[PDB]
Structures are given as C-alpha cells and as structure tokens.
Amino acid sequence: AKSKNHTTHNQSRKWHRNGIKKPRSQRYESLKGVDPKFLRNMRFAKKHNKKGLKKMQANNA
Amino acid sequence: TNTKGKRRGTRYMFSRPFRKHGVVPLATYMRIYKKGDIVDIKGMGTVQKGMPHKCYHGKTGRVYNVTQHAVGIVVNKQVKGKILAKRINVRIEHIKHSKSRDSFLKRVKENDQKKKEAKEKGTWVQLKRQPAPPREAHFVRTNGKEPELLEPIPYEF
Amino acid sequence: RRPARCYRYCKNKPYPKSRFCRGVPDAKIRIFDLGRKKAKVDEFPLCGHMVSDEYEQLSSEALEAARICANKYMVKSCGKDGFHIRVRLHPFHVIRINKMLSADRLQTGMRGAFGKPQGTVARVHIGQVIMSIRTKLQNKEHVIEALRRAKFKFPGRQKIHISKKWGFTKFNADEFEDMVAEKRLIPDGCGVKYIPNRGPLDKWRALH
Amino acid sequence: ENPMRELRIRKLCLNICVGESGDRLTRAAKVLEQLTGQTPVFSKARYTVRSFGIRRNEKIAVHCTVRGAKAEEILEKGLKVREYELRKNNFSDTGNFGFGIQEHIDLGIKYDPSIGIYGLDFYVVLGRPGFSIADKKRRTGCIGAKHRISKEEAMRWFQQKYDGIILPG
Amino acid sequence: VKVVKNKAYFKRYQVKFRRRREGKTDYYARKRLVIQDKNKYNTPKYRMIVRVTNRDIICQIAYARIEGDMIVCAAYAHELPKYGVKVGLTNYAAAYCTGLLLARRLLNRFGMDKIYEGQVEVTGDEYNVESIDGQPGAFTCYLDAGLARTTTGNKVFGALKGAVDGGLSIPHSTKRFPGYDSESKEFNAEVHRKHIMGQNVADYMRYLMEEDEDAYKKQFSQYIKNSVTPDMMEEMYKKAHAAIRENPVYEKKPKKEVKKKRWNRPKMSLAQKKDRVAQKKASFLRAQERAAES
RNA sequence: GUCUACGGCCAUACCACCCUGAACGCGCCCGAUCUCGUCUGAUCUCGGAAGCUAAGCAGGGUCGGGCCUGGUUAGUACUUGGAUGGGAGACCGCCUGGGAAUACCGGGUGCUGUAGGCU
C-alpha cells in the first residue's frame, strides 16, 4: 500500500486550459494600506477644496 | 519534507557578490521614489530588516506607498494557475530604479519634439519603429586582390 | 570486492572523500612516480602517453596493476633508473556498496539503501592521459610496449601517443632547445620554469 | 645635519609576572609603585592551562608604563646594575630593547621580608618625533620606511647616550 | 624562510572607501546624520560641519545630494582678524565667534535678518529659539562633530552656541558645555560665559606673570606681538560679537593676479619609459663585456 | 599647477620601495593653568607658534605585485531544437541557432561635485 508522493505533471497544461490571467490593473486603485498620517491629511485636503475653492478658481478658470 | 522556511534557498542571492562587502554606499539612500515609480527588487545581505522574500528577488513592481525607510510595492507573483498582484513592503536598500521604461520615456520625448518638427515642415517621417529589415542590395568590392582560399586542416591529436 | 563491471561508467555525481563521507578505505596506489624521479629536464627528451577513448571510471586498484606492469618491463629493458613513469590520474571518487544479507531476507530489502564506502575509482574523460613515461630517444619502441601491456589491465579502450612536447613540460620539443638556450626557460630539476620578460628588472640582472 | 629625526625614550614599560594572585601579588604592586610613584595596573590571564596554576580572569601580574624624564631616571638605575653592558640580541628588529633584572633589592629598593624578592622586566621603546601619527584618532597613518628605526640603528644610540657595551659574545 | 603575509592577500583585498582610508569619515554616523526620510522626497537635511584643526576652526552648513554635498555658507577663523580677534584663533572664544559668524551669514543670505536675533548679550545660559507665527520658519540644523570625542568643554560645542545665539534652531542639551558638573547634575552659566569671553586664558596669563615670567615669553609670544593683555581681553571679544552681527557678508578678493603654472612633474609617456628600459639593459651589458675582460 | 573642509563613484584610487615638494594650508611640533580623560597629558581634551619638511600628505618613478580593460585561448568547451544518425554499450558525429573560462600576451593606473585659499 505504497503510493506516489508528488508530481507537477499534467498541471502545466491545465493551468493553460483556462489561460493564466493578468488581473487587468484598472484605473483608480484602492488606498488599502497607505500610511495613515498621509491618508488622514489627504481627506482634509479633499473636504476643503470642495468648499473653499470655487470662487477664487472659477474666475481663474 | 522540504522545510518551508523563510530565507531557505538563498546561499548565493542574499550574499554580497565578491569584494563588495562592508557598509553600503550612501547614494542608495539618496534615491527618491514617488508613487507609480517602477522599481526592481534585489534583496541584499547586509541590511536585515526589510528583505522581501525570495519569491520577489529579481522582479519588478510599482510604488503605491512611500514610508520613512521603505516603499510599498505591488508586484505580480505566479501562484499555480493564476497570477496575483501582491503588495510587499520592502526597505529602501533592497530596491533601485528600474531603467526598463527609460528607453520609452526617451522616445516619447524625442518623438513629440520630432512630431511637431515635421508638422512645421510638411513631411511623412513615420516615427513608428520597425524591426531589423532584410539587408539592402549592396555592392561589395574586391579591389585588386583575390578571395583567399581556405581548406579544412588535417586531424591530429 | 565486486567486479569492475559494476563500478564503471560515470553514473553518480562525484562523491569525494571529504567531511561528509568519513568512512572510505585507502586506495591501493599511494605512490605515483617510479622511475628516476631526481632526473633533470634535458636527460629524457621524449615522453609517451596512454590516452582514453571513453568516459569511464578506472579503479584505484587497476592503476596499481598497470604501474607495476609498466615498471617491470622497463627495469627489464631500460634498466633501473633509465626512465620516469608518472601515473597521472588520481582516485578521488568514492564508490559505494549496498552490502545486503548483512542466505536470508533478514537485514532490509531496499529500505535503507544508501551504501557504505567501498573503494575509490578515478573518473576519466575522453582524451585525458592516464600514464606517461619519459625516456631517451633510443628507447622509443620501449615506450609503446610498456604502455601496450599496461592497457590490458584497464577496462575499455586506450590509445598510445608519443607526444610532441619536450618530456613532462608544456613546451614543444622542436623549439625547446631554441628557447632554453638564450633566456626564456630555466631548468629546476624535473621540470621547466618559464620566465617571462615583465617582472622587476633586477631578476633579469640576476640572469646573464 | 640631521634635523628633528632623532631618538628618544618613547616609553618605559616594567612588569613583574607572578605565578599567582592573592597575597604575593598584592605586595608585588607595593614594589613597582615604590620604583615609579604611580599605581600599577593588574594584568590577568586569558589562558587556563593548569600546568602553571594559572586561570582565566585571575590577576597574574602588575605593570606600568613610565614616560618622559622619569623613564630615563628609572632606566639609568637598571643599567648600572647590569653594568651598562647588554647583549646584541636584546635588540628587536623594530629597534626597541629591554633587559630585565633579578632581585629588585639591587635597584634602590630596601629589603623587607614581609615582601620578598621579585624580578623585573625593563623594556624600552625608542621613538622619533612624528611616531604619534600611528596612534592618532583622526588621520591614522603608516610611519614611512626611512623614519622608522632598526636594530642596527638603536645599538649605536646606546653607545651614544649611556655609552654602553654591546658585548655580542 | 619565515612567513608570508601578502601573496594573494592583494588578490582578495577589499578597500574600504576613499574617505575611510584617509581617516576623515566613519559612514556609520554619516548614514544617520545625512539621509532624509523617503516620504519627504526633496527637503534637504541641513548640518553644521564644525572642524577644529591646527591654527583654524571651520564651520560649514551643507546638505546631501547624490553628486556630492552642497554647502550653503561657510565661516573660517583666518577670516576672524577682519573683525577684531587677531590672535588665538583656536580657543573656545574663537569657536563661539566663528559660529555666530556662521549664523549671521546664513540668515542674511536667506533674508531672515531682522527677525531671529537670537541672544545679543551673552549670558551663557541655554537659549532655544522659537519660530514666530506669521514669519518664515526657523532654520533647523543638526550639529556633527565628525570624528572628535564629544566630552564636555570640547570646543565643537563652542561653535554650537555661537550658532544658537545667532538664531539657528539646533537640538542640543546643556550637558556638554563647559560649566556642567559631572558628579553632580547642575550647570553653571556663569562659568560658561566666563569660558566664552576668554578669561580662562586671561587667568593663565595672570598665572604666568606672577609665577614664571620666562614661560610667559615662550607661550603667549604673539599676544606680546601687538598688545593683548588679560584685562583687555573680555572687552575685546564683545566688540567682535557686535561687529559680526552688523556685517557678515564676506566679500571676496579680486583674486586674479597670476598666470603661472608648473610645479610638479608630469606623468612620463609610454615610449619614454619603454626606451628607459633598453637604456638600462644596454648599460648593464657593457659593465660585463668590457669591465670583466680588460 | 595644486590644496583645505565636506562629498559622490569606492583599488585605474590599494601595497612595497625610492626621488621631489615653491606659496597658502594640512601636519608634525611646545606646554598642562583651566575644560576633560588617563597606571602614563602617549591617546583623548585643553593653552600655543620656538623650530620642521624627517614623517604623514601630495606629485612622479618601478621591464614592480595586484586592480581595470583588451586580445589570444576559440567558434574550443558547453547548450536550444531535430533525425527510423553511428555504436553491443559508454559515448559520438551531423543539422538548426546561441556561445564561454585559465595560462600566454597588450594597454591604462584615479575620475569628479560644493565651498574657500594659494600660485
């Protein structure tokens, strides 16, 4: 009752039977695990450019 | 069976090459990495803290995070039947700037300055590159002398 | 001791006597030069080799039987101290023995199969020399006949070649004497110390 | 004719090497302070060999380095008991020398049976002005071959000052 | 016949650096002094290179770029006789006066003159400049002594407080100025200001009048050169303090004055050193041909 | 033409030895009253300027040693892919492409940034 231990035989042609895929790297990646002091700044910079911007830029635009 | 331990098959690759030991030079630390920079991974052996893993040594990824002493790199890694984008935190001594895009960033420079260089002059420069063509019908010269006759030499031990 | 049919063709990676083997008996050859070893360079001009045709393993024991056979013919012809035989290839590969029944099924089957150190062979490549004498040029047909008897104690196929070099040196014997004459070679015993012309200049002044 | 390339007593280093620690070594430092007037520093063994009675981190000897005019003040005491004659092989290949005495009572020390007899090793190193760049912290450098001193040069120093006899055989 | 130290030692020898063999740097301390955090990306990290030598003290402000260090401003002590201290250019008071010259030259270059005065009269106490709200921020900087031992009273900390009194923000502690008690924990500012105006070296001139006048001609001979006397000296540095605060700009000489060039040998050519060999080989063979036969 | 302070690349820069070194400097050098540190003012810290290029240091030299670079070794050794090729085998040749390494011989021997000084 001794058997066969480990092969990678037949595994290369079934990896390609559905064809190994790049995960397509879309625009706008997530900010999952950016360092927190940088991220905590960057949403303070996103909640004041929506308020205190669009009178002194709409003239310049 | 086969010892699934970190830093396993690295007798030669986490080793300083030959006669380049000692404390590491300082322009390595004076390298500036921004987001989206394309860096290539090469774990050294003197600095012990932020070596990635032997899975990534030799590979090339993109910066998404910049820290005080390290850089967050997304690399593609081959697991069995699919690849995955893995984000690995590597200290700054184990990476460097990859020149792999810098032959494309030269010919977006010398392409756009040459695109408008013919727009002002009205030609058809065809700035798209072709691979090595078959050779031109040239005309060799054998001036004066004669083509030297060579013959296969005999056998000796 | 098994037949050398069993321990022949280079099937394993080389298994030298080192700090991992630590059990291997000593080879039968322990001396390697048997002629007049004290002889100078210019005494024996020509050498003669025996060269392999095939990539096989010659045992350490079979190199002993050939040097006794080649010494015996040439003390019979060239006299004691009229030649210099050098057995050139050294046994470092250690062949192994899986000594079973150690008429019964008692010990194991193939369970702990990795052998015990049995003996030493030498891994010989195609074209590599095995033995080589050097003699006077008046001994030329005793070069072949010593090296034609000593190939009946080796497995496989060997070939006898009288070399174009000056003895056991690396230099061709046509322009050896043209080159040892003025400066470029100096004799130190049985070999030749080629001197360049690019050192410090006081050891050019030590010459002349 | 030779300006400021000249020999001088760089330091003088003395020791007694007692076979053991304890009472016998505590008053060996009483004597080497009686010569020099400065406290000895206890040297201890790093080898445990057990045929000597010696032992690791066991204080085995006393020594000091005396420098300056008090170096040559002790040295003129030890040469007039060795009668200003040395042997030629007391001179090292780096030039510096030393001779050693037995019975420190022959030196200016008065005998006291509570202390006993100890032997010294006087060892003299010679120096030129400029030898200190080998021991400087900031820009440490080698000394240069013509500026170091030899065995053959220090023996004609000993005949110049202290006018001694080399006595080779 | 004895031993062989180097035969393939050289084949496997790894030199340290150009600057470690020469003994200037260490690169263990440099690596911590000179590199910015990577998330700051371009902001220079400034330093204060204070190097005392024989007969001079050099104070520089550099920062680290990949093609070499970039020095902003530099103050010396052979510069110092232009302001009033003509002699004794390596004491603790020429160290302080170089540092205040190094500080005032920087803020004048940056335009931060009128704000950030620092401390005009020297009490010697630990002052620590603060950045004013609405004004351009203070120049933060980090002292590096380099390879000199930093105990108390080391005059590399003399230039440290000359810089602090000029309006430079340097992190430090009073624990290594002269006047800090080692077995206690107190600090004496009165000892430190006496050490800063040069009455430690005025008392030793008073110690060499009334003890041995003959050693006072050997040492302090170039205070007897012009006239420097131990009552005049404490006022004499205060005038140097008040004159480097009102003129730090360091004009440069017109400096042309020469067209002269040759002082050392050039590297001789390949053919000149190749024909030198055969000119030696010919000169040896005549010594054996003619001078062993006749 | 070079240097000093700080550097980058880290031997074409190191190593052994021998010559030369104006002027600034760097340094050896002369002292312990203070600051400080020693068994010892030798080192380390502090006061200088009476002497010195002797050394370090800088240039240059050596049919130098290494180091760097190039030939030769050599289309050699290996190797991709192929054959109902050879041979009892071990191994081998050819096809289609890629292609080293040592001895041996040749040539080089620091290059530069910032700031300040001499000529």
Place this chain on the structure above:
RNA sequence: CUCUCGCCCACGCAGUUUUAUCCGGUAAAGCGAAUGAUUAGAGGUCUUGGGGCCGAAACGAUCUCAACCUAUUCUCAAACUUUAAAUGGGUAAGAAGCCCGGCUCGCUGGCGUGGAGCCGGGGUGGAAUGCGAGUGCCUAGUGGGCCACUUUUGGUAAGC
C-alpha cells in the same frame, strides 16, 4: 449576462518573437585565485629531530636526511569557488499617456518649500504576428495512474 466588430486606424487579448532593461550561480571552467583534498622534484636556510668529522673541549671549523620558506608541477569537489554560458524569469513598448495654468491640505517645513489631491485647458499615427472579448452563478466526475526522448536520485542491476 455585459459589450465590440456589420460600409487616413482595433478597445482588448496572447503556452510567440523582436527592441530596451534588470534577475540568477547551472553546465563549462578554475585551483601557479580563497576553502578543502593532493603527487613530484628544484632553490634558500632561522631552527630543532640525528650522524660522519678536526677533539679531554668549544653556535672556532667541514657535511647529510628532515623541517620551514620561495618559485614551480600532476590530479580533483552534489553539500567549494574568482569567472561564467545556452535555456529561462520579471518589466516596459502610451490618451488610465504627455504638457500647461490654477486651488485645497490639519502632512512636510529657512522659502509662494516638499509632496499628495482637485479643477480647467492643449495637441493621438506610437514593435512584428495572430485573435472578438469581459464577467457572474450553478456544477457532476476525479482525488490508485502509467509510458517514452531529455535531465536527474537511491541501486550491482531491474519490465526496479
């Protein structure tokens, strides 16, 4: 199911090459380069290990085997290596790009510095070949394999 092709240039993709860029320590090679094995002679002699020798005696005198050192020489290494292939692995070959101006920030801080984000604006022809792609749910069987080149481990060998 989501879409793309129906009538001067693919969105997208790839068990492929090319063009640039790195990564590695296999084969080979090396050991007159380190580590570890290892044969031979040559030259110089501090030295001890012993003899021939003037000799009551004498590092006063004449020598050898060694030993050590120097320059050489033969032969090696899956658990050695300076060097080092072929085959191979990652990445890049554009509008999700390039550039300009402006606004936000509590982060950074000599500095209207640094860096992120945000808004508005300007110009698309950017290796070869081939192919229509994207995505979700549900899901059975299988989880004893065997063989042949080539490369390999144990074994004398095996249809092992």
Place this chain on the structure above:
RNA sequence: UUGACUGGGGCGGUACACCUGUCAAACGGUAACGCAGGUGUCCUAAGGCGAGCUCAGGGAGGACAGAAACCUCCCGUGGAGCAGAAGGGCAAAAGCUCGCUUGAUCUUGAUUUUCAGUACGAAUACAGACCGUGAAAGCGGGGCCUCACGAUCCUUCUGA
C-alpha cells in the same frame, strides 16, 4: 479501546510539527525509510542606546618562563567572535570593554511567509501613546537574519 507512515506486516526507525546546506537541472516550485547535521532551549543581558576599542594567527625582543603565563613593538580583509545546527551577514562593526537603562511595555488596522491564498507561529512597514539612551541626527516596541512552538469547550487571574 489496542495510532500512523512503511519497497508485505512485525521488530527498528520517525522521513508524524519544525529549521540549515545539498539533491534541484543558474527566477520561484519540486519526491524517496535520499545525503550531512539540528530543535522542544538559553538570556535582566546574551534586550535597548551611546562611547572607547580590535580579532584569529605570526614574527622579533623581555628575570625565572619552557610549544602554552604576562609585557612591548611590527604585520594582520576578518583566517576570530557573534549562547548553541548550518548557511548568509558584519571592522572607528552586528565583535571586546564600559556608562546608563527596561521599547521583552500600551493600542488599532494593513502587508508578508505556509497557503485553499484559511488559521496558528514567525515577520515586515506604519500609525496614536507613554518611555529609554545619546551632544544631536537618531535608534529602540526582544535576541544580526533564517527555527524554537498550540483551536473550540472548561478553568484561573487581571481590566472598567
């Protein structure tokens, strides 16, 4: 109720959880009761930080003192040491000596390793605290890196 693996089973051994070099065929992965060994600990310093220093070995000198005692000078690219198995790494050092200390503490996420891309263990990069040390830059949340360990239920102690 009477383990499993197993060149049938038993006896033997543990290849049953794990780490190092090799096999392994130059990214990674890769089997056998393949080879050479190792682990179930040790450490209030052998953790932390700063300073000063240089190692193994050899040569030549020094009273006893000799192959090995201590003293000095010179050479010394790691031939030493780093708690222990190996491999990697390290010289104004990661080694030796000394001075202070407790970051071997509190807290939330992310990432890596094995991997199904689950967990444990180990680890990396942070962040918010409170601290140590150093003149400062800084470094530090255990040991120079690769191992040194353990669910549910139950119990015990601590926390508002």
Place this chain on the structure above:
RNA sequence: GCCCGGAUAGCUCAGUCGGUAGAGCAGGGGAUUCCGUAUCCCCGUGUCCUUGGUUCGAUUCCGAGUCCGGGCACCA
C-alpha cells in the same frame, strides 16, 4: 557469515594523566641457614599489530588495513 572489544617483555595482565614502559610467574645471580624449604633482593625480556594524521610530545588520541575472540539472526 553480519557486527563488538582486543593486538604489551620468554608469558599472563593492568593501565600507556597527550609527557613512564609497570604488577605477577618461568630463567640467572646473590642475601637467609648447620644444610635445606619457603622467603627477600637484583639484573635482564618490550617492531607497545603495520601505515598515515593530530602539538619543544602518541604505543597512548584519531582512522586505514590485517590478525583474534565475543554475535545483530521473525512470521509464513
């Protein structure tokens, strides 16, 4: 014929602390005695199994062979 310990005087035997060659018998000479027996003393007798390694040091430690005694030993 697989492994475990041995190899020492004319013999047996201990050890050969990494630094000697030692009990005890056989032999030879003495001493003792009236003469003997026992007894006592002494002198001999070591390729320390060969070869290679490991330090002013190996028979002693390591390990290669040979020589010798003692044995790992299933169920079918």
